[PDB]
């Protein structure tokens, strides 16, 4: 067909130019234009190659869809089996060692790949199932958790108490600003909550902060770590896609288990209901999380925003979910124009179920946790979630997002805004 | 293959254990666990069998999709052609004779079956079309109804007047509590209204009650008959699925007719607009109905609830439809937490078009009926319904519902709640 | 092949024989009326059956197995010649166009049957929708002058590039911007220019100053479809009602499909931009429909929004598709099924309108809104939003049924009567 | 709460209602003056709603937004007993006494009350013997 050979050729011109030209930021305009054109030809061919060959490629890596691979494993195995399609671990380590501004944008190739995989009605669902399986880290910590009711992680403190999995986001120095480690901890904690049979409901809440401007106050989330993003430490795959397809999707659909229990034939996934309590504010990735909870409580003084309207990245799946909560006018006000929404305004009730004075909040949270216990809730939330968000809807969106977001992650406007934080 | 034989084997172990063990409630724990494990193995194999063979099975029963069979006929024919897949009429009669608490849960097998059928892009739409055809009972009563303008049925009084089919729900002793007979009446009445060419618009309204606590007052619906549900008299197929796929779906999409009139090529279905008027309250199945009308009126004092949040069954297709009316937050408040919504609160306007004082209501209902007459309305409501609810969306949901609801119908929590009413 | 083409050919001939022999439309007896109605019905039925099985093969003949993009007007013309009797010839249409709606035989209905069948196909459907997203020849031809001058005057639309904004002013000053086939052509042409012009970052749609005595000196957004023309037989199913939905309006949403002629085409085959609408006076019918696709909407304090023809009108475009998502099913029915008019100042205006402003504050609020929508973040976000809000299948499935439902309403007796009284 | 009972609500420090309740002064066409509602209602609801209620017999439901003009808390029948108990514990101190005395003094002057009751004494007497009233009342 010619496409693999043409791609291999275009990738080689890219490697030849990168080997011979000066470092990024010492390049002339002619040189900058030449490498940009080379990248463009190669990426174009990655797309065309995968438009026709994605299923065959995915079948090679997963043994015709009989081995579930998570994202990180999938893209690594794709790199070794299809050199030049997506970057090697080594090529990525060079990239990770640079600040965003200096990067070549190899992650974009991973966006191209994941787009093509998720677009497939065969490969797509299969990858999404892989990401709903429990993480190894969670399987390994599960017995100690069952025994102790407690796990301390770098970014999340998890405690079982009165049948509730209490996730406290506890990055006290930086307003629960998100990074790759927080995602790993979140997923790990979400997996433990779901697998633990002494947990009936989940609670997500921000912990007490220690930074001087917030000392002694709880804060839910200030969204993505902008410093790290500037410094090159936000991974397309291991942060931006992982969170969407992993813990966040697990909140919605539960964890896919193996056929190892009664009832698996009607409930292959273990799902539970989730309550979020918002102190201070929920910004960006933290606001995005609220679109997935069964119940949402907020302090009277809180606000909700997706602020990077002019020069930001796409706010995860908020573009997918927000409209269903707020309609297309408010969804655009919030996302396209950065409208911030306060707990006490009427439109907060589009996102938040209960708004309560700081001194009444603990007790309201506790009451809300008792209301979500039974099997009726489980069945009903499953049916509700199925109606709200079809698997195809989610998959289609995440397919385009994988590439759209990859591009935004390397947009000059973003790199500039982020560097000023 | 191997699956039909393995299923046949697992069903025989079930029949041997049922024949040899004591009656339900005289069984020991060891015996209870043994029969549960047998049921589980068999039901698992029903699922696996149908995952691969559902289309071939359905093709056998319907002559490769050239005979439309309704649900009751389809499951009966499946039982005789595929012994052990779904229960026989005989096995069901034994079940129906028992109270819910004592049943083996054979209807669950029917849930497995219907799930698999509705999941199929070929079988699914076909079965849905069969259930949109007119009922024989309605074809038989149609000429008398055209002549007389009047039919009295056990649970529903139907009257043609001024171009309006007035359905009055008239179970005056029990607040229009629903059962299998009511569904048969409702579908029959809906069929007549649609087929009768002197009917332009429908009206659904609760009749005057006679129970002492409501004497002389109209009441719309108190939802499912909980006594009958406890006593074993609520049929998964003939009540819970029949109403969703029959009269309720006919309110939305109309009756599928044979090619026997002009214009059939553009309008194979005869659809008309429907007005609902709510007196007293609409609970459960009655509240569910409101999500399908073109216009909804309520008395100032009325409320709307889907109350069985802790230990109830799934409220029909409310989990499918409610979100589009109220968004995800309110939809969860109503269904997950049992929030009841009053006619006079602002959020009633999400469900109700007009709220009127009891003494102004009759006249407001009459005016609403005159506003829905033309051909412009027919065309517009068709286009609106098509956008609001896709055929795939409906089908996918009813597929999962079929099994999810079957399981809830036999859940210990439900059986207990229902026994206390 | 399987008998359907022949049976259709036969039913079309009985139609022609009856039309050639019976008296003209308003001179027919009841027996005659009923005979020709029955003949039309048999033929139309067979058009549907024929296309239920053969639509892909038909569409493949006309487009060389989906390798040539044809727009609606070309597609239906080419179908008429390659499949006589399936859809009307240019000649048969000219006879129809020369009659008032009341006297027409309803040949456009056959085009509705055709387009329904095409759009229902998962292969032909998307391919036709892509054809309609391509830039119009008229726009490609005007593009260099537009890039040079920043200005184009058309019959129904004035277009001006200024401070990075494509300012579309609808300027049918004698008629409250009442819509017709020429307005659509102008609108699509202007939308195409705005999208293709690299010095345009954002669009603005606004009604111009009116000259009719009841509105002299006042801006008006839209009074919707030209009812006089509709009565007189001059509103085309294909060239007006489908063209606007699949062309400019869809381009406001999805952008213009270009050829592979620039960097980044592999991620962005379509050039899309954000759009602002500003509503003065009122937005009625087709004008109100347009508001369901803008990124920002501003209205004057005294404006209202309506889709008024609830009793005896045609379908209001894709409002039945889109309105529910904005207002929910109750309000959407109140507006469409019962003709509820919505005022800029009522709370429920906020379902449709982002900002409501006093007439003397409005120009400046429009200018501020245009500066807020500039970047690449907005482009990426609006794309992801539009993709979530309206799936390509959803849009297609709806437009498929609309093509026929609307064709029927275009020839409904009720409509023809209401329209004749205007 | 109807008539004289509705009138009483205009004098309490706290008012709770069940979700299903309503408030009316119904005898708009052929009734007597509803006590001091004509004096007090305007301060709670303004002159437009006050006339809607008294001149035209508009009935006001617990769950409608305007109920908040007359009622502090609206609660579901099963939550009501406990909400009543909590409201009682919030009104205990000496701060409350002092504040309610000052609030009452500002809301209704002794002259205002007295002037109104003076006209009411005769206006109501006349209504108590009006032919329209005697006819309505005889039909009940
Ligand atoms: C939250 C604030 C208003 C608080 O302001 P103040 O009250 O003035 O306190 P600060 O002292 O600024 O905050 C305390 C402390 O937290 C740290 N902090 C606050 N916000 C951040 C962020 N976003 N990153 C890192 N560190 C932060 C900052 O370092 C501050 O002080 P030092 O640690 O001493 O340097 C402010 O910090 C702020 O506006 N920050 C930037 C807001 C912002 O743009 N957040 C990112 C929005 N975008 C996303 O989340 C994008 C996203 C995330 C996803 O997960 C997925 C996806 O698809 C897209
Ligand atoms: C309506 C009420 C609040 C009124 O309270 P009161 O004024 O104190 O009335 P009651 O005296 O209890 O009722 C009057 C009268 O009606 C009878 N009544 C009222 N509702 C019912 C029901 N649902 N079943 C049986 N009998 C009933 C009640 O028993 C009395 O008759 P007697 O026992 O012979 O005296 C109350 O009666 C009540 O709680 N009713 C039950 C409400 C309920 O839980 N309904 C079921 C909700 N759940 C569904 O609809 C489930 C469903 C339906 C479906 O169609 C589909 C689906 O997928 C799921
Ligand atoms: C807008 C009004 C309420 C206000 O007008 P008034 O202030 O009462 O002054 P008028 O004298 O009526 O209007 C001034 C002027 O414009 C003319 N006018 C106003 N509206 C129209 C329309 N729609 N067509 C033609 N001419 C018009 C009117 O006849 C006057 O001109 P002269 O007769 O030349 O003096 C009135 O003009 C009116 O009632 N218009 C009809 C409203 C209407 O039905 N609009 C269309 C509704 N239906 C659709 O849009 C259908 C549609 C459109 C689509 O684009 C797509 C689709 O799928 C379906």
PDB file of C-alpha atoms and ligand atoms in Angstrom, chain C residues 174-179 212-215 222-230 240-241 244-245 248 282 284-287 289 304 306-309 313-318 341 402 406 422, ligand 3:
ATOM      1  CA  UNK C 174     -37.751  46.890   3.066  1.00  0.00           C
ATOM      2  CA  UNK C 175     -38.780  43.507   4.602  1.00  0.00           C
ATOM      3  CA  UNK C 176     -37.390  42.910   8.025  1.00  0.00           C
ATOM      4  CA  UNK C 177     -34.693  40.568   6.594  1.00  0.00           C
ATOM      5  CA  UNK C 178     -37.311  38.126   5.420  1.00  0.00           C
ATOM      6  CA  UNK C 179     -35.501  35.123   3.974  1.00  0.00           C
ATOM      7  CA  UNK C 212     -39.864  50.245   5.929  1.00  0.00           C
ATOM      8  CA  UNK C 213     -42.032  53.012   7.648  1.00  0.00           C
ATOM      9  CA  UNK C 214     -43.035  50.890  10.733  1.00  0.00           C
ATOM     10  CA  UNK C 215     -39.284  50.287  11.495  1.00  0.00           C
ATOM     11  CA  UNK C 222     -34.980  38.543  11.184  1.00  0.00           C
ATOM     12  CA  UNK C 223     -38.685  38.113  10.479  1.00  0.00           C
ATOM     13  CA  UNK C 224     -38.019  34.629   9.161  1.00  0.00           C
ATOM     14  CA  UNK C 225     -39.067  33.053   5.891  1.00  0.00           C
ATOM     15  CA  UNK C 226     -40.590  35.185   3.098  1.00  0.00           C
ATOM     16  CA  UNK C 227     -44.229  34.087   3.427  1.00  0.00           C
ATOM     17  CA  UNK C 228     -45.328  36.014   0.271  1.00  0.00           C
ATOM     18  CA  UNK C 229     -42.763  34.135  -1.810  1.00  0.00           C
ATOM     19  CA  UNK C 230     -43.705  30.858  -0.139  1.00  0.00           C
ATOM     20  CA  UNK C 240     -33.649  27.222   0.352  1.00  0.00           C
ATOM     21  CA  UNK C 241     -34.798  24.815   3.088  1.00  0.00           C
ATOM     22  CA  UNK C 244     -29.373  26.637   4.486  1.00  0.00           C
ATOM     23  CA  UNK C 245     -29.372  23.747   6.974  1.00  0.00           C
ATOM     24  CA  UNK C 248     -24.067  27.982   5.917  1.00  0.00           C
ATOM     25  CA  UNK C 282     -36.618  40.382  17.119  1.00  0.00           C
ATOM     26  CA  UNK C 284     -38.461  35.135  14.243  1.00  0.00           C
ATOM     27  CA  UNK C 285     -38.589  31.729  12.626  1.00  0.00           C
ATOM     28  CA  UNK C 286     -35.460  31.045  10.537  1.00  0.00           C
ATOM     29  CA  UNK C 287     -33.739  33.901  12.319  1.00  0.00           C
ATOM     30  CA  UNK C 289     -33.205  29.085  14.511  1.00  0.00           C
ATOM     31  CA  UNK C 304     -38.108  38.796  21.504  1.00  0.00           C
ATOM     32  CA  UNK C 306     -40.241  33.235  18.434  1.00  0.00           C
ATOM     33  CA  UNK C 307     -40.996  30.247  16.235  1.00  0.00           C
ATOM     34  CA  UNK C 308     -44.570  31.278  15.681  1.00  0.00           C
ATOM     35  CA  UNK C 309     -46.208  29.002  13.103  1.00  0.00           C
ATOM     36  CA  UNK C 313     -46.554  26.283   9.655  1.00  0.00           C
ATOM     37  CA  UNK C 314     -43.649  24.371   8.330  1.00  0.00           C
ATOM     38  CA  UNK C 315     -41.085  22.727  10.502  1.00  0.00           C
ATOM     39  CA  UNK C 316     -38.722  25.450  11.924  1.00  0.00           C
ATOM     40  CA  UNK C 317     -35.588  23.965  10.460  1.00  0.00           C
ATOM     41  CA  UNK C 318     -33.290  22.343  12.952  1.00  0.00           C
ATOM     42  CA  UNK C 341     -42.771  33.810  22.343  1.00  0.00           C
ATOM     43  CA  UNK C 402     -36.547  16.482   7.879  1.00  0.00           C
ATOM     44  CA  UNK C 406     -40.561  19.317   5.510  1.00  0.00           C
ATOM     45  CA  UNK C 422     -50.275  36.919   4.790  1.00  0.00           C
TER      46      UNK C 422
HETATM   47  C1  LIG E   3     -42.549  40.392  12.101  1.00  0.00           C
HETATM   48  C2  LIG E   3     -43.958  41.023  12.293  1.00  0.00           C
HETATM   49  C3  LIG E   3     -44.666  40.376  13.578  1.00  0.00           C
HETATM   50  C4  LIG E   3     -43.814  42.502  12.509  1.00  0.00           C
HETATM   51  O1  LIG E   3     -44.216  43.142  11.390  1.00  0.00           O
HETATM   52  P1  LIG E   3     -45.233  44.658  11.768  1.00  0.00           P
HETATM   53  O2  LIG E   3     -44.320  45.440  12.727  1.00  0.00           O
HETATM   54  O3  LIG E   3     -46.523  44.018  12.102  1.00  0.00           O
HETATM   55  O4  LIG E   3     -45.081  45.199  10.249  1.00  0.00           O
HETATM   56  P2  LIG E   3     -45.390  44.501   8.768  1.00  0.00           P
HETATM   57  O5  LIG E   3     -46.054  45.572   7.881  1.00  0.00           O
HETATM   58  O6  LIG E   3     -46.010  43.150   9.021  1.00  0.00           O
HETATM   59  O7  LIG E   3     -43.768  44.268   8.233  1.00  0.00           O
HETATM   60  C5  LIG E   3     -43.004  45.236   7.579  1.00  0.00           C
HETATM   61  C6  LIG E   3     -42.692  44.825   6.136  1.00  0.00           C
HETATM   62  O8  LIG E   3     -41.942  43.540   5.953  1.00  0.00           O
HETATM   63  C7  LIG E   3     -42.874  42.579   5.297  1.00  0.00           C
HETATM   64  N1  LIG E   3     -42.629  41.365   5.950  1.00  0.00           N
HETATM   65  C8  LIG E   3     -42.555  41.118   7.315  1.00  0.00           C
HETATM   66  N2  LIG E   3     -42.281  39.834   7.621  1.00  0.00           N
HETATM   67  C9  LIG E   3     -42.178  39.237   6.359  1.00  0.00           C
HETATM   68  C10 LIG E   3     -41.904  37.917   5.913  1.00  0.00           C
HETATM   69  N3  LIG E   3     -41.653  36.846   6.818  1.00  0.00           N
HETATM   70  N4  LIG E   3     -41.857  37.669   4.549  1.00  0.00           N
HETATM   71  C11 LIG E   3     -42.076  38.737   3.684  1.00  0.00           C
HETATM   72  N5  LIG E   3     -42.359  40.009   3.958  1.00  0.00           N
HETATM   73  C12 LIG E   3     -42.388  40.243   5.308  1.00  0.00           C
HETATM   74  C13 LIG E   3     -44.369  43.013   5.500  1.00  0.00           C
HETATM   75  O9  LIG E   3     -45.327  42.355   4.571  1.00  0.00           O
HETATM   76  C14 LIG E   3     -44.047  44.617   5.278  1.00  0.00           C
HETATM   77  O10 LIG E   3     -43.708  44.957   4.041  1.00  0.00           O
HETATM   78  P3  LIG E   3     -44.875  45.665   2.999  1.00  0.00           P
HETATM   79  O11 LIG E   3     -46.000  44.646   3.066  1.00  0.00           O
HETATM   80  O12 LIG E   3     -43.846  45.630   1.856  1.00  0.00           O
HETATM   81  O13 LIG E   3     -45.200  46.987   3.653  1.00  0.00           O
HETATM   82  C15 LIG E   3     -44.848  40.753  10.896  1.00  0.00           C
HETATM   83  O14 LIG E   3     -44.185  41.236   9.738  1.00  0.00           O
HETATM   84  C16 LIG E   3     -45.218  39.275  10.742  1.00  0.00           C
HETATM   85  O15 LIG E   3     -46.181  38.845  11.350  1.00  0.00           O
HETATM   86  N6  LIG E   3     -44.383  38.503  10.007  1.00  0.00           N
HETATM   87  C17 LIG E   3     -44.620  37.030   9.775  1.00  0.00           C
HETATM   88  C18 LIG E   3     -43.837  36.242  10.850  1.00  0.00           C
HETATM   89  C19 LIG E   3     -43.664  34.867  10.367  1.00  0.00           C
HETATM   90  O16 LIG E   3     -44.556  34.052  10.235  1.00  0.00           O
HETATM   91  N7  LIG E   3     -42.388  34.597  10.008  1.00  0.00           N
HETATM   92  C20 LIG E   3     -41.910  33.310   9.466  1.00  0.00           C
HETATM   93  C21 LIG E   3     -42.228  32.029  10.375  1.00  0.00           C
HETATM   94  N8  LIG E   3     -41.888  30.788   9.658  1.00  0.00           N
HETATM   95  C22 LIG E   3     -40.591  30.592   9.254  1.00  0.00           C
HETATM   96  O17 LIG E   3     -39.735  31.436   9.396  1.00  0.00           O
HETATM   97  C23 LIG E   3     -40.367  29.281   8.570  1.00  0.00           C
HETATM   98  C24 LIG E   3     -38.966  28.716   8.308  1.00  0.00           C
HETATM   99  C25 LIG E   3     -37.946  29.548   7.942  1.00  0.00           C
HETATM  100  C26 LIG E   3     -36.725  29.010   7.663  1.00  0.00           C
HETATM  101  O18 LIG E   3     -35.598  29.860   7.321  1.00  0.00           O
HETATM  102  C27 LIG E   3     -36.485  27.660   7.705  1.00  0.00           C
HETATM  103  C28 LIG E   3     -37.485  26.811   8.016  1.00  0.00           C
HETATM  104  O19 LIG E   3     -37.130  25.455   7.955  1.00  0.00           O
HETATM  105  C29 LIG E   3     -38.752  27.279   8.337  1.00  0.00           C
END
